[PDB]
Amino acid sequence: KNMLLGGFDTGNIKAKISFLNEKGNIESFAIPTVIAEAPPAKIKDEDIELLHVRIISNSLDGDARSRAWYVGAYAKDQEDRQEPTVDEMQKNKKLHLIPLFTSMAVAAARIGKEEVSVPFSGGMPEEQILEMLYGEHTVEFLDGTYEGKKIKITINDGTMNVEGVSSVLAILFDIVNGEIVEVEGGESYAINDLGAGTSDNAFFEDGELNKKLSTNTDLGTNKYIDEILKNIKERFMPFKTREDFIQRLVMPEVEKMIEDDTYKPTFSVKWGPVKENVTDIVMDGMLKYAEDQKASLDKFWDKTNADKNIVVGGGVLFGYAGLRDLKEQDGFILPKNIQESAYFTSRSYLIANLLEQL
């Protein structure tokens, strides 16, 4: 006890966590990989909307030893903001450490604990990276829902879930108080994690990750989202972030499509004194993404000739209109609790973590 049980899925867009709440169920959220330097003091998922925290950790160095930061969404609106840099084709570690530690703190505050030991269950694209996380980290909230709260994080042990079925555990198992099998259900399989800026095409063969064939591409949803937003604004001539677009406009329609196959979705945007029906625009981009993913998945199927192909990530949901065809394809496996497809990997790491502590 006094222990936070979580799976940690960190990328360049978001830092994702799936953890056990007080009622023993899985709780998931994400913190954008964005930080900004902040003054020592104050100036669904509401508690992460304003993250102004002080972090004391030996995993940080230089003029970041022990100071205050704006983290995630609230950092994105700062001129100072630091984001992952990408060429036209470490020691930026605080970009990843800070949102990571922050997510641990937020989770701890959610379950009402001030001091948590956190066995690290994550993944990488081992011990060298784990030792970068070892030690004691204090996170103090200077604003927001948990203002004045001080959380002491202790990371003694961990794993990066490299080999075995650890990465795929969420395809078969859930945690409802703990620890049950999924309501519906080979030796060589591919896990395709369809993400925002990336697509992870991993191939597991005989209990082993095939490090040769396991590839990673920039085939994400963001480019297709960008295009849709270009055509919407152009249709008028609205949304602050892509997440805003996904949350306010897309997610409600996708959920309706999930829980009822006869439902045809509608997309209308209210901008100024004008309201436009842009259903055709959004659907075009969705299917374009689906078709492109269909093509990408097939040629990876052929390259590995895996027995089964598992498709996960938020891309499954964003392109559900087209990608739901995979449910009637033998050799393709969509998660059955498809509503939780975005947090598949972090949920897998969480389940692997609970099994470790048993």
Ligand X SMILES: Nc1ncnc2c1ncn2[C@@H]1O[C@H](COP(=O)(O)OP(=O)(O)O)[C@@H](O)[C@H]1O
Q: What is the closest distance, in whole angstroms, from the C-beta atom of residue 318 to Mg ion in the complex?
A: 13
Q: Does 14 bind ligand X (CB under 6 A)?
A: yes
Site for ligand X in 107-146 (CB under 6 A): none
**Minimum CB distance to ligand X smaller for 142 or for 290:** 290
What's the rounded Cα separation, in Å, for the pair 106 and 293? 34
> Binding of ligand X at residue 342 (CB under 6 A)?
yes
Stretch that binds Mg ion, among 6-14, 66-74, 125-133, 279-287 (CB under 5 A): 6-14
Give which of Mg ion, ligand X, none residue 221 binds (C-beta under 5 to 8 Å, depending on kind). ligand X
DSSP string, 250-264: IHHHHHHHHS-TTPP
Is residue 152 within 8 Å of 327, Cβ to Cβ?
A: no
Nearer to ligand X (CB atom), residue 250 or residue 278: 250
Rounded to an integer, what distance in angstroms lies between the CA atom of residue 68 and that of residue 41?
A: 8
Window of 44-52, 139-147, 311-319, 349-357 that interacts with ligand X by CB under 6 A? 311-319
Burial class from Cβ neighbours inside 10 Å (0-12, 13-18, 19+) for residue 358 reads exposed
CB of 345 to Mg ion, least distance (A): 6
Token digits of residue 40: 């020592």
In the list Mg ion, ligand X, none, the entry touching 142 (Cβ below 5 to 8 angstroms by class) is: none
One of 32, 72, 158, 315 touching ligand X (CB under 6 A): 315
**Bridge partners, residue 181, by sequence:** 173
**Nearest to ligand X of 7, 314 (CB atom):** 314
Q: Residue 333: which of ligand X, Mg ion, none does it interact with, CB under 5 to 8 A by kind?
A: none
Q: What is the largest CA-CA distance in the chain?
A: 59
Residue 319, interface with Mg ion (CB under 5 A)? Answer: no
Give the DSSP H or E segment for 100: helix 94-110
Minimum Å gap between C-beta 162 and ligand X is 19
Burial of residue 182, with CB atoms counted within 10 A of its CB: 0-12 exposed, 13-18 middle, 19 or more buried: middle
- Residue 201 beta carbon to ligand X: minimum distance, rounded to whole angstroms: 14
Interface positions, 212-271, toward ligand X (CB under 6 A): 221, 246, 250-251, 254
If one asks whether residue 195 binds Mg ion (CB under 5 A), the answer comes out as yes
| Residue 315 interacting entry, from ligand X, Mg ion, none, C-beta within 5 to 8 Å by type | ligand X
Residue 99 binding Mg ion, by CB under 5 A: no
Least Å from the CB of residue 348 to ligand X: 13
Q: How far is the CB of 181 from Mg ion (least distance, A)?
A: 24
- In order, the DSSP letters of 147-172 are TT-EEEEEE--EE---SGGGGGGGGT
Q: Which stretch binds Mg ion (CB under 5 A): 125-133, 167-175, 178-186, 187-195?
A: 187-195
Cβ contacts of 91 within 8 Å, gap of 6 or more = none
User: Strand order in 52-56's β-sheet?
Assistant: 35-38, 66-71, 52-56, 135-141, 150-155, 115-117
Does 103 engage in binding with ligand X (CB under 6 A)? Answer: no
And the tokens for 195?
Answer: 């993400």
Which entry of Mg ion, ligand X, none binds 246, CB below 5 to 8 A by partner kind? ligand X
Amino acid residing at 127: E
Site for ligand X in 141-200 (CB under 6 A): 195-198
Place of tokens 């996170």: 139
Query: Which residue, among 90, 102, 38, has the nearest Cα to 64 in the 3D structure?
Result: 38
Q: Which residues bind ligand X (CB under 6 A)?
A: 11, 13-14, 195-198, 221, 246, 250-251, 254, 313-315, 317-318, 342
List interacting residues with Mg ion (CB under 5 A): 11, 195
